[PDB]
Write a protein that binds this ligand. Sequence first.
Ligand SMILES: *[C@@H]1O[C@H](CO)[C@@H](O[C@@H]2O[C@H](CO)[C@@H](O[C@@H]3O[C@H](CO[C@H]4O[C@H](CO)[C@@H](O)[C@H](O[C@H]5O[C@H](CO)[C@@H](O)[C@H](O)[C@@H]5O)[C@@H]4O)[C@@H](O)[C@H](O)[C@@H]3O)[C@H](O)[C@H]2NC(C)=O)[C@H](O)[C@H]1NC(C)=O
Ligand SMILES: CCCCCCCC(=O)OC[C@H](COP(=O)(O)O[C@@H]1[C@H](O)[C@H](O)[C@@H](OP(=O)(O)O)[C@H](OP(=O)(O)O)[C@H]1O)OC(=O)CCCCCCC
Ligand SMILES: CCCCCCCC(=O)OC[C@H](COP(=O)(O)O[C@@H]1[C@H](O)[C@H](O)[C@@H](OP(=O)(O)O)[C@H](OP(=O)(O)O)[C@H]1O)OC(=O)CCCCCCC
Ligand SMILES: *[C@@H]1O[C@H](CO)[C@@H](O[C@@H]2O[C@H](CO)[C@@H](O[C@@H]3O[C@H](CO)[C@@H](O)[C@H](O)[C@@H]3O)[C@H](O)[C@H]2NC(C)=O)[C@H](O)[C@H]1NC(C)=O
Ligand SMILES: *[C@@H]1O[C@H](CO)[C@@H](O[C@@H]2O[C@H](CO)[C@@H](O[C@@H]3O[C@H](CO)[C@@H](O)[C@H](O)[C@@H]3O)[C@H](O)[C@H]2NC(C)=O)[C@H](O)[C@H]1NC(C)=O
Ligand SMILES: *[C@@H]1O[C@H](CO)[C@@H](O[C@@H]2O[C@H](CO)[C@@H](O)[C@H](O)[C@H]2NC(C)=O)[C@H](O)[C@H]1NC(C)=O
Ligand SMILES: *[C@@H]1O[C@H](CO)[C@@H](O)[C@H](O)[C@H]1NC(C)=O
Lengths: 333, 331, 331, 328, 106, 117, 209
Amino acid sequence: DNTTVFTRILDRLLDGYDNRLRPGLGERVTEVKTDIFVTSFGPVSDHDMEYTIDVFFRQSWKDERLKFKGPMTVLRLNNLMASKIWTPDTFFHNGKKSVAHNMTMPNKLLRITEDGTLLYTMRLTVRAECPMHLEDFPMDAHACPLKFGSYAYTRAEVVYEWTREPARSVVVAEDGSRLNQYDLLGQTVDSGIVQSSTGEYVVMTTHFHLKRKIGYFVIQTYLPCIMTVILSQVSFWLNRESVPARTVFGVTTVLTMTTLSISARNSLPKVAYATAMDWFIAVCYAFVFSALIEFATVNYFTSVSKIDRLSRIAFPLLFGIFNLVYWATYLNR
Amino acid sequence: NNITIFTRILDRLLDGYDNRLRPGLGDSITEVFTNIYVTSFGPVSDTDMEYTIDVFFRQKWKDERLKFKGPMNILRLNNLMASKIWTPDTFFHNGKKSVAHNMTMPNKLLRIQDDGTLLYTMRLTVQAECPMHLEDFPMDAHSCPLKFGSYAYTTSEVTYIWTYNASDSVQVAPDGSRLNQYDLLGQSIGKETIKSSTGEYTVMTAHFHLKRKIGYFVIQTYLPCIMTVILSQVSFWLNRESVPARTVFGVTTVLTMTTLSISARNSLPKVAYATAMDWFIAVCYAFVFSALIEFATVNYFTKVSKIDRMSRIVFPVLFGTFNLVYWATYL
Amino acid sequence: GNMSFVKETVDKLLKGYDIRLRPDFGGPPVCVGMNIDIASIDMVSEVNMDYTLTMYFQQYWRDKRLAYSGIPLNLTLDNRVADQLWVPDTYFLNDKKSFVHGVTVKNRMIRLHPDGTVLYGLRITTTAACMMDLRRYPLDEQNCTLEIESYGYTTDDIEFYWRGGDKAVTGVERIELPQFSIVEHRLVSRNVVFATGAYPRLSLSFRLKRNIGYFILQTYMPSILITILSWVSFWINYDASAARVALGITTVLTMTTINTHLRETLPKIPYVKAIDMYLMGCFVFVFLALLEYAFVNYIFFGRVNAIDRWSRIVFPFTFSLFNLVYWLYYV
Amino acid sequence: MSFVKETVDKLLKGYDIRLRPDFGGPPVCVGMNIDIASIDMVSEVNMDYTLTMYFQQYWRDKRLAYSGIPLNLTLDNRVADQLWVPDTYFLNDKKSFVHGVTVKNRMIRLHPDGTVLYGLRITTTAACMMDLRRYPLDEQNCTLEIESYGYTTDDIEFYWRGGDKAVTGVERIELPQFSIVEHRLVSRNVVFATGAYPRLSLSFRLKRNIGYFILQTYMPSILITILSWVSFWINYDASAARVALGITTVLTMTTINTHLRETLPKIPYVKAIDMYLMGCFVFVFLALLEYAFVNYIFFGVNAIDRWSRIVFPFTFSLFNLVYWLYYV
Amino acid sequence: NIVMTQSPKSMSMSVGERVTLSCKASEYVGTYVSWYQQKPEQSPKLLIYGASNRYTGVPDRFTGSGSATDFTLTIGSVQAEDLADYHCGQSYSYPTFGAGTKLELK
Amino acid sequence: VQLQQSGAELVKPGASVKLSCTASGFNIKDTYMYWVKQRPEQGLEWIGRIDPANGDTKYDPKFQGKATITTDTFSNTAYLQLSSLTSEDTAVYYCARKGLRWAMDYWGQGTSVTVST
Amino acid sequence: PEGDVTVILNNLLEGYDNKLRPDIGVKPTLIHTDMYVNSIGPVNAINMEYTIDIFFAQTWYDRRLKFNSTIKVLRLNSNMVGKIWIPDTFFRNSKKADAHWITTPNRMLRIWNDGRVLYTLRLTIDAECQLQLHNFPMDEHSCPLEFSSYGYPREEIVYQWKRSSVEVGDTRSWRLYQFSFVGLRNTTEVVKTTSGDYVVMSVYFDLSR
Ligand SMILES: *[C@@H]1O[C@H](CO)[C@@H](O[C@@H]2O[C@H](CO)[C@@H](O[C@@H]3O[C@H](CO[C@H]4O[C@H](CO)[C@@H](O)[C@H](O[C@H]5O[C@H](CO)[C@@H](O)[C@H](O)[C@@H]5O)[C@@H]4O)[C@@H](O)[C@H](O)[C@@H]3O)[C@H](O)[C@H]2NC(C)=O)[C@H](O)[C@H]1NC(C)=O
Ligand SMILES: CCCCCCCC(=O)OC[C@H](COP(=O)(O)O[C@@H]1[C@H](O)[C@H](O)[C@@H](OP(=O)(O)O)[C@H](OP(=O)(O)O)[C@H]1O)OC(=O)CCCCCCC
Ligand SMILES: CCCCCCCC(=O)OC[C@H](COP(=O)(O)O[C@@H]1[C@H](O)[C@H](O)[C@@H](OP(=O)(O)O)[C@H](OP(=O)(O)O)[C@H]1O)OC(=O)CCCCCCC
Ligand SMILES: *[C@@H]1O[C@H](CO)[C@@H](O[C@@H]2O[C@H](CO)[C@@H](O[C@@H]3O[C@H](CO)[C@@H](O)[C@H](O)[C@@H]3O)[C@H](O)[C@H]2NC(C)=O)[C@H](O)[C@H]1NC(C)=O
Ligand SMILES: *[C@@H]1O[C@H](CO)[C@@H](O[C@@H]2O[C@H](CO)[C@@H](O[C@@H]3O[C@H](CO)[C@@H](O)[C@H](O)[C@@H]3O)[C@H](O)[C@H]2NC(C)=O)[C@H](O)[C@H]1NC(C)=O
Ligand SMILES: *[C@@H]1O[C@H](CO)[C@@H](O[C@@H]2O[C@H](CO)[C@@H](O)[C@H](O)[C@H]2NC(C)=O)[C@H](O)[C@H]1NC(C)=O
Ligand SMILES: *[C@@H]1O[C@H](CO)[C@@H](O)[C@H](O)[C@H]1NC(C)=O
C-alpha cells in the first residue's frame, strides 16, 4: 500500500490530460530549453559527405498540467510515461538516417519536477550531412553543422533555447574521440529563424570545427610520389649508350606515377574541380615526362652529354623549388 | 451457421485461457515432438565460419485445455491463433541470424486436433555457426552442426524429442542444393543435456556432413602455381651468355609467385596456422627462387654450366616427386 | 487443480502492478545482480573499429510486489509477461547496433522466484565500439570494453553489482577468435557522474593480443625475400646494364605495390605502424641497392670490383642489423 | 455516407478472421495476377534475382457481401488486418518487403458480391540456382514459387486469373545483361509431409547478351594470342625481346584469368570462358616453349620458324571454329 | 573572457539623420548580442535582443545587423527622445559589456 | 514585470553591506538573476548569475571572493553580500533577469552605494 | 489547451470512420500536392538510381472535420495522423524509401475551420532513373519521380499540382557531383492498369554532366 500513493498521483495527472496539445496553447509560447552531451564524435565519411555523432539529446520545457504535490519533489519516472504526455517534435534538418537506441529498454528518461518542470533526454546516433569543400585536400578544414528544430510548430508556438550558457551548452566527452582521420578543434552554436511555406521556424544550429590530419596522405601519396621523382632523376646519372636501361627508368616511373594518380582519387568523391593533392601529382606527373623527353633528346643525339650534365643539377633544383613553394602556401593558410 | 459453430468452439477454448503458463505446468512436463524439412541448404560461406539453411521447423505438443468436441477433427487455423495460445520457445543455440518470412502473411501453420494435439510449423532461414579447422585446406570435410533447445524451460519443464525414427526426423529435399563448393553427404542427429548457468537444458542437435570439392582451387591456385614453375625451368635451357633474358624469367616468376601468394590467401579466414595450400605455394616459390640463384651461380662462373645440365634433370624430377608425395598424403 | 491455483496467483500478482514505478520507489535503491554467459565474440574489424559480441545477458533483482507463498517451485512464465513487469533500463554506452534474437520467438527468459526475486535473461548480439591504437600493428594488443550502465535511474534509485564475484562472466575461456587471442578479462564496477546525476556502471573488458603467424605468412616473408632478391644484382657483372636495372626496378615496384596493397585494408590513421616502418625500411634498402648500382655506373662509365665486393658484404650485414633492432624493440 | 458507414460496420460485426470463408465446406478459390514492374537485377554471386511486382489476389467471401450501395467500395488498407486474407508465400524468397511509404502500399477493394480484391506491391529477392557451365553463352531458368502455407488444396485452390495473360510487364522488364526470352505459368500441386498444398509457378528464360563479354574478355584474350606470334618474326639471336613477348603474354594471360574468376562464385566445374582462356594459355605457353627450343636446337632454325609462323595462326583458327560452333 | 569595443566614444548630430554604431567582439559570438540604452538617472532597457530582432515597444527606426564578429546598430532618423548612450553586450558566454557610446543634440 | 530594489545606503570602508532585489509578477525558479556593476560615467560590468532551481552560482573572475548571493524563493527576493568592500567601489548596482535570447529585458530601478565619510 | 480545443477534437473524432475517404459516393476527392526538395543525393550510374530528400505536402478537404469556433487553425503534431483519413500516395518508381522517426515521426497536420486539411511529411526516396550510356560521359538525363494513389482510381482521387508544385533549395550543397541541376518540369497523366485508371503526377529533373 506504500506504492499506492504514487500510483494515485500518476493516474490523477493523466486524468483529463490531452497529449495532442502543447502546454499553454492559448496563453503563451512553449519554451523548450535544450542542450547536447556528445558521448562520442564518430567517424566522418568523406565519400558520402556525412558524420556520425552519438548524443545525449536533453530537452526541458514547462507544463502546468503536470503539477503534483507529494512525498518527493522530482519524479524519476519510467520511460513509457513519456509517450502518454506531450513531447516536442524536434527533428534534425540535415539528418540522413538517425537511430534512437532501444537496447534493452528504450534509452530515454523522463523526470517531472513538482512545480511542472520536465526533463526528457534521449540517446541518439545521428548520421548528419556535412557539406564540405574538398579543394585544399588534404590540408583542409570543415565546419560540419548539426541543425535541429521543431517540425510542425511555428516560432509563435514552440521556441527553442539553450539550458546553460551557449558556450557551455554543447559538451564533448573526453574519451569519445572516434575520429581517426580528422581532428576536432571545438564547437560553436547559434540560433536563428528559417523561412518555409508553412511558416517561420526557430532553428538551432551548432558547428563542429574539424581539421584533417595529413599524416596518412604523406606516407601514402606524398612520399611515394617524391620517391618516384627521385627514381626518375637518377636516370641522368647513367651513360648514354644504355638505351634499354634508361627506358626502364623512363617507362616504369611514369607507369607507377599514373597508378598513384588513379589510386589517390578512389577515397575522394567524384569531384569536378581539382584538389591540392591533384596539383602536387600533376606537377610531379610533369617531371617524369620531363625526364623522359630528356632521355629521348640525348638518345637522338647519341663523350658525356651537356644535357645530362645540366639535368643532373636543374631537375633536383626545380623540384626542390616547387616543393618549397607548394608546402609553404598550403600549410600556412 | 457452420462458421458460427466453429466460432463458438474457438472462443470457448480461448475463454479462461492463460498463455503465460506452459501446458501441464503444475501437473507434469510438456514434450515437444520436433522435425525439420530442409527445403534448401544455403551456401557454406567459409570466410566467416557459418552456413545458411531453410527449414520448415515443425513442433508438436499436447495441451489439455485445447480439447474440442465438434463436427471437425483438426482445426486448420491461421497465424493469429498461434499468438493467443502457448507456443514453445525453441531457439537455436548456434544461430547467428534467422529470417521468419512473413510475406505475404506470416509463414506459420497451427492445427489444433480434437484430443489436444497441436501441430505448429514455421519457415526459417537459420544462419547457424559451423566451427571450421582449415588445416587440411582445401581437402577438408567439415560437419556443420545445428543445435536447438528451449530457452527458459529446463529438463524439468520441457523435454524435446525427435518425432519419427531419430534417423528420419531431419529430412532434406532432393532439388534443394545451394551448395556450390561442397556437397551434402549425410545427416546425423543427437540428444544431449547442457548444464548452463540457469540449469540443465535438453538440447537437440543435428550434424550435416560436408566435403569440399577440390575443382575450384585446382584451376585458379594449383595449376597457376605449377605452370609458372615449369615456366621458371625454361631458364635452364637457354644460352649461358643471355644475361637479361634469364633475368626477366626470374624477376617475373618470383613476382607472380608473390602475387599468387597474396591472391590465394583471399576470401579465406585470417587463421593463425599454415594450410596445406600455403605448404604448396611456399615449396613452389622455393623452387623458383632456387632456379634464379642457380642462374646467379651460373652468371658468377661465366667468362655450358655442367650445373646447368644437371639442373635440367634434378629440378623437374624433384618437383615431380614433391607432387607425388603431396597429392598422396592429402588425397 | 494446481494449474488453476498458479493462474489465480499470477493474476493476483499482476492485479495493480504499476509498471511505471520501480520497486521500493520511495525508499532505498534496488540492487540488480548481473552475470553474462558469452556465446562467441564475432568479427573484430579494425576498419570500423568495433567488435560483434553475442551474450546471455542475465539480470537479478528483488521486487517485493511479486512475492507468493503458495507455489513451492520457481515459476518460469512465458516471455511475453516481461512487458507487464518492471525491468531496469540497462543500456550499453559503446553500442552501435544491437538486437535481441527473434527466432522462433523473442529470445528472453523470465522466472519468478517465490521471494519476489526476478530472473530476467536475454540473448543479445551487440556490436560494441572499440577504439584501437594501431601504433604497434600487427604486434599490438588491444583493450576492448563493453560499458554497461543504467540510463534513467541514478545511484539513489538503482545499484549494480556483478553476481558471483569474478565468476560472473563465463565462456570467455572457450571462444576461438581466428586472428586474436584472449589474454585476460576484467570486471569493473564504477559510479560515473553526468550533468543529470550519478549513475552506476559495470565494465567488461578483454585484452586481445594478435596472433602474428598470418602476418609472417602474408606480408613479412614476401617483404624480406624481395630484399634478398635485390642483392642478386651485386653478383651480376657491371656491363650487363639491362638485367641489373630490371632487377632493381622490379624490386622497387614490388615493394611499393606491397605497400599500397597492404594499406588499403586499414583505416586512414595519421601515424605510422610497425609494419609500415618495416616496409619503409625495406624500401630504403632496395633504393640504396639501386643507388649503389647507379653509383657504380656513374664511376665507371662517367669517369668497381672493390665497390661491388664491399656492397655484397655490407648489405646482408646491415639488413640483419635492422632485423635485430626491429624484432627486439617491438617484441 | 451514412449508409456506407453503417454497411462497413455491419459487414465487420462478427467477422471471425481466424476462419476462412466456407470453413466447413468446399475450398475457396484465390485467383492471382502479377504485374511485374521491373526485374531489379540478376546476380550470379549470390545466385538470386530481384522481382518488383504488383501482386493481386482474387477470392470471394460471403460475410463481406453488401446490397444497397451500388459501387465497388475501396476501403483503406487498414481494413486488411480485420478481413480474412489468403496465406500466399513465395517459396524461393530469401528476403522481401512491402513499401510502407507514404502508407502501406496495399489495396482492399470489396466488390458487391463479397469478392475481395486484395493487391500488394512486393519486392522479392527470389533464389534462382544457375548452371554456369556455358557461361557466358548460357541461358538461365529463374522461377518464383507461390504457394499456400497453412491451407491444403481441400482448404484453398489457386489459379492464374487470365491464364497466360496474368503476368503482364515481362516483355518490357529489362535486366542489363540478360534478355527475357519467355515466361511460362504452371499450376503445380506439390505434396509436403503435412498435406497437398496448391502452388502457382512463374518462370522466365534468360539468355545472356554476349557483346559485353566480347568487349571485355574475349577480344583482350584474342589479341594476346596474336601478340605472341610477333616473336616468330623476331630473329633467333635476339633472346631478350622474344622472352619479353613470351613472359608478358603468359603473365597477361594469367592475370586475365585471375581477374575474371574473382567476380564469379567458387563453382567446381569449368566454364566455356575458362575453357577459352585455358586454350589461349596453352597456345601462348606453347610459343615461348617454341622459341626456347629453337634457341637450344641452335645454341645447345629458319625452317622451324617458318613452319611455326604458318601452323600457329591456322591451328588457333581451328580452335576458334570448334569453340564458336559447339557453344553456339 | 570576452571583451567588447564600441566605437567611437561620442558623436553629435541633429534631429533626423543616419547614425551607425559599431561593436566588435574579441572572438566568435553567434547572435546573442544585446543593445541597451541608458537614459541619464534612469534604468537601462532593451533595444534588440539577439541580432537584427526588434524588441516589443521600441520604434521601427532602430535596427541592427549581425555577423560572427562585428555588430552594428542603425537608426534611420534620430529623434528628440533618444538622449541616451547605447551599450553593446554579449551573451554567448558569461555576459560582458562595452564602454558605451554617448551622443548629444545641438 | 516589475523589479524592485531597496534604497541607497551610506557605509564605511571595510564594513559589510546588504542589498536586495525584489521581483514581482514572475517567479525566480525559471529565469536567471543577473547582477551588474555600473560605475559612474562608465560602461556596465557583470558580476555574477544565479540559478535558483539548484542554487548554482558563477561569479566574474575579477569579483571572486568579493560578492555573495543568497536567494529566498518564499520572499521572492535575491540578496547581495559584499564582505570586504573598499572606498573605491562607489557605484550603482542594477538588477536584471534573463530575457528571450539571453538578453536582459527587465531591469530594476538601481541602487547606488556610497562609501565616504 | 483551454478546454475548447479539447472538446473540438473530441467532437471531430466521435463517429469518424477513417476507413472511408471524404465524399465516398458523391464526388472524387481533389488533392493538391506540394513538394520542397532538400537535396538530391548521389546519382548511382551503376544501379540507375538516385536519392532525393523532399518535404512532401498534401492538401484535401474533409467535410467531417468542419468546426465552428474562434480558433481558425488546429496546428497538431503527428499523433492525430493515424486517427483521420490519409490518402495512400505511393511512389511508382521508388526502389526503397523511408520517412524519419526521431525524435518524433516527422509529420505535420493542420486543420482549418472550413475542413481544409494540410498533411506534410519528410521522405527520402531511392527512385529509379533511366540512364543512357550512349555518348557517355557527355550526356543529359531527365530523372523522373512518379507518384499516384495505390488503391483509389481516377473516379475516387484526383491529384493536382499546387502553384509552387516543386521548390528547390540552395542548389549549392547538393550532391550533384557529375551533373548540374538544369531545371524541373511537373506533369500529370492517367495510366490504365488492371485495377483501373489512376492519376499519376510526375516530376522530371534535368541533369547535365
Ligand atoms: C514482417 O515483419 C516485419 C518485422 O520484421 C514487420 O515490420 C513492422 O512493420 C510495422 C508496420 O509498418 C512497423 O510498425 C510501425 O513502425 C513505425 C516506425 O518504424 C520505423 O522503425 C522500424 C524499426 O527500425 C523500421 O522497421 C520501420 O521501417 C519500416 O517502415 C519504413 C517506412 O514505412 C520502410 O521504409 C521500411 O522498409 C520498413 O518497412 C521504420 O523505420 C511506427 O512509427 C508506427 O507507429 C508503427 O509502429 C514495425 O515497427 C515494423 N517492425 C520492425 C521491427 O521492422 C512487417 O510489418 C511484417 N510484414 C507483414 C506482417 O506483412
Ligand atoms: C628537356 C630539355 C630539352 C632540350 C631540347 C634541345 C636539345 C638540344 O638542342 O641539343 C643540342 C645539343 C646536344 O648536345 P649533347 O652534348 O647532348 O650532344 C653533343 C652534340 O651533338 C655535339 O655536336 C657532338 O659533337 P660533334 O659535333 O658531333 O663531334 C657530341 O658528340 P661527341 O662530342 O661526344 O663526339 C654530342 O655529345 O645540346 C646543346 O647544345 C645544349 C642545349 C641545352 C638546352 C637547355 C637544357 C636545360
Ligand atoms: C643450384 C646450383 C648451385 C651452384 C653452387 C656452386 C656450384 C659450383 O661451385 O660449381 C662449380 C662448377 C661450375 O661449373 P660451370 O660450368 O658453371 O663453370 C665452369 C667452371 O668454372 C670450370 O672450372 C671452368 O673450367 P676451367 O677450370 O677454367 O678450365 C669452366 O670454364 P669455361 O667452360 O667457361 O671455359 C666453367 O664453365 O660446377 C661443378 O663443378 C659441378 C657442379 C654441379 C652442380 C649441379 C647442379 C646443382
Ligand atoms: C582496459 O582499460 C581500462 C581503462 O580504460 C582498464 O580499467 C581499469 O582497471 C583497473 C584495474 O581494475 C582499475 O583500477 C582500480 O580502480 C579502483 C578504483 O577505486 C581501485 O579501488 C582498484 O584498486 C584498482 O586500482 C581502473 O579504475 C580501471 N579504469 C577504468 C575502468 O577506467 C581495464 O583494466 C583494461 N582492460 C584490461 C583487460 O586490463
Ligand atoms: C524452368 O524449369 C521448370 C522445371 O524445373 C519448367 O517447368 C515445367 O514446364 C513444363 C511445361 O509447362 C511442365 O510440363 C507440363 O506438365 C503437366 C503436368 O500435368 C502436363 O499436363 C503438361 O502437358 C506439360 O507437360 C512441367 O511440369 C514443369 N515442371 C515443373 C514445374 O517442375 C519451366 O517451363 C522452365 N522455364 C521455362 C521458361 O521453360
Ligand atoms: C523498442 O522497445 C520497445 C520496448 O521494448 C518496443 O515496444 C514494444 O513493442 C511491442 C510490439 O509493438 C508491443 O507489443 C509492446 O507493448 C511494446 N512495449 C513494451 C514495453 O514491450 C518497441 O517495439 C521497440 N522498437 C523496435 C525498433 O523494435
Ligand atoms: C505544372 O506546374 C504549374 C505551376 O504550379 C501549374 O500551373 C501547372 O498546372 C502544372 N501542370 C502541368 C503543366 O503539368
